[PDB]
Structure formats: C-alpha cells, structure tokens
C-alpha cells in the first residue's frame, strides 16, 4: 500500500549468549535468539510474504522452510542463521500495529517456553519441589523477568514522503566526503533536490538505524524491580526460582547439580529438548570436551581400542557413570576427573587411562572458539541479502562439516567451537569462500584457544575482545587475532593477515619445528632479541639466530635449509600485523610459540 521501510532490532545478544555454563547453553541461547527473529519476521511474512523482507533473505532460511512451509529438513536446522537485525517494507498504515504484534508474539512465545520449561523441570526432576508449590513457579515475579528480558525495537520511515536530499542528511549528521558526492550524483540523475526518501535509500537505512538505537535505549531501561533472594548460578543477575523462599543451602539442594536457575536460564536448559521434540534434531557435540577430543581423532582412536573396557570399568565404579554403553560425562575420558568428581574401583580406571595415554597419546584438553565478522537500490540490497544468506547457510556449513560445532552463521558473521587442529584451516577457508562470493569484501576474526575447564562466559568475552579490540583495531582490518589462554593463566596474542596461514602451512619452517627442544629455544632467543630494537638490525639478527638453531644432515643440506627458513620468515613477516619490524618479528614468533605449544597441540 503506502511504502514504508521498517527495521527490527533484538537485544541483548552477547550478554545473553555469554550467560552459559555449558556449550549446550551457548548453542541454545544463540539458536533461541534466532527463533525470536523468526517469530518476528513471521508477523511480516503473514501480511506481506518473503518478498518484502529485504534482510535477511528468508528464501532458503531453514527456520523458514521447516516452521513456515513445514517441510522436513535435516540437522542444518540446528544452526542459527537469522541475525538480530532485519529490514522489511510494509504498509505505512500497518507499521504501528506491526510494532505491537511483534512485541506480543516474542513476549507470548517466551512465556510459553517458560511454562513448558517449568513442567519439564518438575516432570524430570531438574527442580525437586512439592507438587503444590510448583504453581508458585508461574507467579508474577517470574513472568516479569521472562517478559521483560529481551527488548524488541521496531522503527520505520515513509518511503514516499519527499524531502530535500542535502538538508535531510546534513541534519541527521551523515554529511561525509562520500555521502556529499553520492547525493550529488543522485541530483544529477534527476533535475531535483526535493525527492522521495526512497531516492536516498542507502542513507535512509543508516538514519533508520540511528532512529533504532534511540528506540532501544528508551525501551531497555524499563525493567521492573526484582524480589530480594538468591540469584541464578548461571547468570548471577536474575532471581533464581524459589530464591526468595529458601536460605542459600536449602535452595541449592532443590536443583539438579545444585545450581539454582532463573527463569531465562531455565528456558535455556529446556530449549534443547524442545527443539529436539519439535525437529527430532540435537547438536552432535554437547560439551566443549566433545569438540576438544576431535583433535587428530583422538576420541575415535580411543573408542576403538579402549571404549568397551573403559565403560565396563566405569560401571564397576558406578552404574551412574554410564548410559547406553557410553560415558554419561564426556570429561570422564580424563584421569584427573576420576581423582576428583568405592575408592579402589577407581584406582583401576585411572591406571587404565594412564597406560592408554602412553599408547595413543594424552587426551586433548584445549579447544578453540572462532568468531568472525565482516569488515565495513532496495532490490539490489535484496540481492546482497541473498548472497549472504547463501554464504552463511551453505558455504560456512560446508567447510565446518562435522569437524566442529557451527553455532551461528547469520551472513558475514560466524560463531563456532572447533578442535585446535582445525581452527586455523576452517577460519581461513571461510574467509576464502567469503572472498569468492564477491569475486574486496574483508572479514576479520578472533580465535581463542582455551582449556576445557575455563568458565565459558570469560572465554566468550576474550574471543569477542580478540575480534573487536585486536583484529578490527588493525588499520585496513581483514585480520585474524589468535589468542592462546593457557590454564596457568598465561595469555599469548598474535595479529596476523589471512595469508600467514597459507604461507606457514606450506613452509619448511613448519616441518622443521614439528620435528624439533630446538624450535623452543629458537623461538625464545629470537623473541628475546626483539624485546627492544636489536643493535645489529632485524635482518642480521634473524640470520644469526637461524644459523644458530637450524641445521641439516650435512654442510650442504644445512646451507640450503638456513637459506630457506630465513626466506620463509621474511615472507611470513609480510603477513604479520604491527607498526614496525620488531613488532612483526614478535608477532610472528608469538604465533609460532602458540602453534608449537606441546600441551595445546600434543
């Protein structure tokens, strides 16, 4: 009818996602957020179809195919592909009512999962509470928290309305060097300054965004007071259910694993079963240890020479540690777990694993968190939405495969948990595909390598930091910030260009290190030569250290080797971020220090 541009924004995102103890909560949060966008986009598709939703492109969106068209689709449904922002065109007369419908649908949807969640929690002993006092679980205090947690912000603008090109953009504060010219070329294409807004669509989107941000900070601070009482063990913010009726000890004795959950985190624990009973699907790897154990198929090699025995000696300790001839807790593959979480029947399990470690190698204890983000008419905008929709649904999914857990892929952004020996390769390919998708378009990323016991909220925060304050802070961006957070607390960071990965993989330096404590002292001496500017100069120092630690089998072979390692180092130096040569040498060697760490890459 009367053309109107409408933007949708859902928050909070990262704070919600970060509030997770298990990888399953992380996935659930991400997935649920995507479901919220879906519940919001359906309100517009019901009234105008997928042709009026410019971004994201619903066309091939699994959620759209399975929940809207009802088709039967596979595990690809488990990946969150809908971002938290969207653009559509609606009847200007419909706008205001649509803003009310969308808020109500999301609000009703959550209250529903909550009610389903509470029944599930009781019927499955997540919370051991009287049949009677189960009703207090749906009192107002808890409904408030569920109802007010997310903030769906919708703002729109009339496309038909006419305004003075320059006067509108200047007043919105968009008069850049670019915008100034762009507009001109638009006044050239038409003998006029007073046009219909849809004539400056691009700049319209940005104004709409600003309008959107104004809307969110007015809506997100309206939260209601909360009853005094013990807080949720997962997020620490909201009241834990029953947290106002019991003392701290009595409260925790009422929950599975003694961890009191608030309404949101309860929905969080319940979301996986919901999605499973509604699609018959569930994530292949439930914990970070499952992903960690993919390193060099360690897990698969263990289940083919010690699987049966381990499960057997497990029951001997307790029938609980098993379920379907499998281990209940994936972390039971580690010695330490048994010496912590019939004393004598355990000494066996430990020693069994200890020996096994000597035959196939110690079990991987580190995993990787990969986060990626794009660096930096309407119908053409739609074409873009589709290239991105297709890149995130098919290409990203394509390169990850089953070597890790792809949690989110909403276009030019990615979140994934991967074993350490697949992180660099996966990240690189994703970036490569992204480039091909546009025959340019740069992508930045953060990879954090962390121990399986590290609190998930903190790891997620460091991964974001690596992305936003390291990688994206590099001039020209298009950088990968690699961070290694060791259990001892030591944290090594390195900023590199995407090509360093390729150059390093096919290098002699790489082979030479994977077969040397020679490489360790080479890395130490060089780093020690770059704490400050080396008097003899970067180049000469590198040759000196190369001659010092590199050797072949005979005078001629070692001559060739030193010459190649040095050359590869200079090449690699081409792809390390830094304000000068000493910073680059440091960065490259910190990177090397990271990939040659024996504990992380056993």
């Amino acid at each position: 009818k009367d053309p109107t541009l409408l933007r949708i924004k859902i928050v909070p995102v990262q704070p919600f996602i970060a509030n997770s103890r298990k990888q399953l909560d992380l996935w659930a949060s991400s997935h649920l957020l995507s479901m919220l966008m879906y519940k919001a986009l359906e309100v517009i598709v019901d009234k105008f179809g997928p042709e009026h939703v410019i971004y994201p492109s619903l066309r091939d969106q699994p959620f759209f195919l399975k929940f809207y068209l009802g088709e039967n689709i596979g595990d690809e449904i488990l990946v969150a592909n809908l971002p938290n922002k969207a653009l559509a065109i609606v009847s200007g007369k419909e706008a205001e009512k649509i803003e009310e419908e969308i808020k109500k649908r999301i609000r009703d949807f959550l209250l529903q999962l909550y009610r389903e969640a509470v029944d599930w929690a009781v019927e499955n002993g997540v919370v051991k509470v009287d049949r009677s006092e189960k009703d207090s679980m749906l009192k107002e205090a808890y409904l408030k928290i569920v109802r007010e947690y997310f903030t769906v912000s919708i703002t729109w603008v009339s496309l038909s309305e006419k305004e003075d090109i320059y006067q509108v953009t200047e007043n919105a504060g968009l008069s850049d060097e670019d915008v100034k010219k762009w507009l001109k070329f638009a006044e050239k294409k038409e003998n006029s300054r007073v046009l219909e807004r849809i004539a400056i669509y691009p700049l319209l989107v940005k104004i709409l965004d600003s309008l959107g941000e104004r809307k969110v900070t007015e809506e997100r601070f309206e939260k209601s007071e909360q009853l005094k009482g013990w807080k949720c063990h997962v997020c620490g913010e909201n009241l834990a259910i029953f947290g106002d009726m019991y003392d701290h000890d009595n409260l925790k004795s009422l929950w599975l694993d003694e961890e009191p959950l608030c309404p949101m985190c309860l929905i969080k624990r319940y979301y996986p079963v919901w999605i499973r009973s509604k699609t018959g699907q569930k994530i292949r790897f439930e914990s970070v240890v499952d992903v960690a154990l993919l390193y060099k198929n360690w897990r698969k090699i263990f289940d083919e020479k010690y699987g049966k025995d381990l499960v057997s000696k497990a029951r001997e300790v307790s029938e609980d540690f098993v379920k379907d001839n499998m281990l209940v807790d994936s972390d039971l593959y580690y010695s330490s777990t048994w010496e912590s979480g019939d004393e004598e029947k355990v000494k066996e399990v430990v020693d069994f694993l200890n020996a096994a470690y000597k035959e196939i190698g110690n079990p991987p204890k580190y995993y990787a968190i990969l986060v990626m983000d794009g660096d930096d008419t309407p119908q053409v905008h739609v074409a873009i939405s589709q290239a991105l929709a297709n890149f995130s649904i098919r290409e990203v999914r394509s390169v990850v495969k089953d070597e890790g857990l792809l949690i989110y892929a909403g276009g030019d952004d990615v979140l994934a948990i991967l074993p350490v020996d697949k992180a660099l390769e996966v990240a690189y390919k994703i970036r490569k595909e992204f480039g091909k998708s546009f025959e340019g378009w740069k992508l930045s990323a953060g990879i954090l390598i962390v121990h399986y016991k590290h609190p998930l909220y903190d790891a997620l925060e460091k991964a974001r930091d690596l992305l936003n304050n390291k990688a994206k802070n590099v001039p020209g961006k298009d950088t990968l910030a690699i961070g290694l957070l060791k259990r001892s607390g030591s944290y090594y960071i390195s900023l590199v260009g995407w090509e360093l990965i390729r150059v390093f993989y096919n290098s002699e330096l790489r082979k030479k290190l994977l077969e040397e404590g020679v490489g360790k002292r080479f890395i130490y001496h060089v780093l020690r030569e770059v704490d400050t500017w080396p008097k003899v100069g970067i180049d000469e120092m590198l040759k000196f250290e190369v001659i010092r630690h590199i050797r072949g089998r005979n005078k001629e072979e070692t001559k060739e080797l030193r010459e190649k390692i040095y050359g590869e180092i200079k090449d690699l130096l081409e792809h390390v971020r830094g304000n000068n040569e000493v910073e680059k040498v440091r960065g490259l060697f910190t990177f090397l220090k990271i990939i040659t760490d024996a504990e992380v890459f056993p």
Partner: protein, 281 residues
Amino acid sequence: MIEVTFTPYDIPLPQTVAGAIRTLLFYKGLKNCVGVGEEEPEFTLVGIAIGTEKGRIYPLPFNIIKSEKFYKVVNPGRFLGKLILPPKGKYKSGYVTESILEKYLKGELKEVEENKVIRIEKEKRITVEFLRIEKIYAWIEDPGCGIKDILSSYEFLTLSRVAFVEVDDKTPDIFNRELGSTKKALFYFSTPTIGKVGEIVQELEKRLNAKIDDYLLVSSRPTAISGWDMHEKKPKGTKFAIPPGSVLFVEFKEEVEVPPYIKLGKLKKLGYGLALGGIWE
C-alpha cells in the same frame, strides 16, 4: 561538602564506600546516622570517582567513538523532529582524565588522542578480578553526623581490605563550574543512575523547573545493581541502572542554567545518580 580520598591496599564500589563509613560510625557510637536496618544512611554519598597516578579519571562518554588514531566526539543529529546519534562506529571503552572530561562538558572537545584514553590494568586473584586502581574519591554531604571529624582521627579504614584515609573539607572544582545558559544541555552520569529514562527526565524537569522538548540517552547495557539485605539475610533485589559514561542529551523548551552537577534516580544517598552538567551545539 567534604572530599574523602581513599588509598587502597590488599556490592558496587559506591555502596562499599557508603557502607564502609556507616560501619565506622556504628562502632564509634554515632549510630544516629548509620541508619540501622535501613537501605540508606543519614548522610549522603554524593558520588565516587577513581584515580591513578594521573589523578581522577572517568569512563569515556558513550558518544565518543574510536576512528583510527583518534576518539571522535559525536554530537546529536536530527531526523523528523527526533534527536538522534549518527552511526559512526562501535564504542570502544576506556577512561579519560578529569581535565579531558571538563573540555568535553564545555563542548570544546572535538576529538581525543589515542594515547590519552586510559585503560585500567586488571589483576586476577585466587578466582576473582580487580582493577589496579590507585585512589578512590568520595564526596559526602554530612547533615550533622560529624563524619569529617571522625575520619580525621583515622588514617586507616576498612573497605576485607584496608585503605588509607584523607579528608579534605572543600567541594571539588568539577562541582563548581559555571556552564551558563542554553537550550542544548547534556548530563554525564558519573555513577550508575537507577531509574526509568522517562522518570529521570521528569525529575530533571521538576528539578530545574523547565520543560524538555526532546532528549536522547546515549548508553550501552544496564548495570545490574545487587547488594546485601542484612535484616532479610538475603541478597537485595536486582535493579538495573544506566551505566557510568552514559550521556543524556537534552533540548529544553526555554533556556536553562545548567547546574555543574545534579543527582537523579533512586539510592541517591548511596552514591548513585551523580550526573555532571554539560553543553552541546
């Protein structure tokens, strides 16, 4: 107004300061202000600020975005009658010195150099994380509890860590500024301010007895405010505050004389709601 400077050595920081003083009066008999079994004390903690070797520092205002080697100050734009903030990049956090904050409040700051933005050094401990802070400043309005004379008899107080105490009886320059009159004023929240945007604004109106045609809140994500409830033996109910660094842009109907500072929201007595006056063009 008295200014107390705490030098630490091995609930939010504001309440910690507030409570540290309440406990001191308690054991020192002067319970006439401790406010036994009450949320707020008798005296009012106007606010708290932190410091390093460089002196007092403040959270970088949320409308100052990093853009290459500079932190550009972004002022309000306008669209169809609404005050808006033009899109110009993500907000990167950090702190700023009082000197810099003053230029910003006067509207004289266009951009701040990269090496001028401070990043507070963290410190892990066993797990817990703390900020390598050197000084904590506290401004208190004592209706007659004789807090100044009591503190001046102590060099050390408990914040369970300990801190050296210094009590200067003189309001800081930041609170004595002369901003002038204008219709385009701003309010920088130096401490978490508890309340609904709309409520804060009303209060702001009925306080400067003026009318507000439009306002824009540049903030980030709510600060969750906890606290212990002694008589209840439980944790206080969570409240969500507008985080320090947030800027309330205001456009008055008729010119107003911008106060150098003003308190808003709940828990004023505990240090919350300290807003500093500013101006924009």
